[PDB]
């Protein structure tokens, strides 16, 4: 019973999170059967602090799918966006 939520983060100057998972990754601490990308840490006073939470699964960023991608590709993409990052996340209600 999850839902897809759209969250806008304004880099200031970063997003303010750490992520894990991906194809060929070593899993994640939330859903071990899922090779997707998960938020593992959010800076407490950072740009994502009232918007994202550990456990969120990132499935899209500025229109780019995060399904079936490797962690390195997700990291490079998120770092390359300069300002607005519009995420679709899957979150437990």
């Amino acid at each position: 019973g999850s839902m897809e939520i759209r969250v806008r983060v304004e880099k200031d100057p970063e997003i303010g999170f750490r992520i894990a998972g991906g194809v060929g990754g070593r899993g994640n601490p939330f859903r071990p059967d899922d090779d997707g990308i998960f938020v593992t840490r959010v800076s407490p006073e950072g740009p994502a602090s009232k918007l994202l939470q550990p456990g969120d699964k990132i499935i899209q960023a500025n229109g780019y799918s995060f399904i079936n991608i490797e962690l390195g590709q997700a990291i490079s993409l998120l770092k390359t966006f300069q300002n607005t990052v519009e995420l679709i996340i899957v979150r437990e209600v």
């Binding site: 970063e14 601490p29 962690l71 998120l78």
Partner: peptide
């Protein structure tokens, strides 16, 4: 598991 650095 492997965590990215901060971004």
């Amino acid at each position: 598991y492997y965590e990215s650095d901060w971004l």
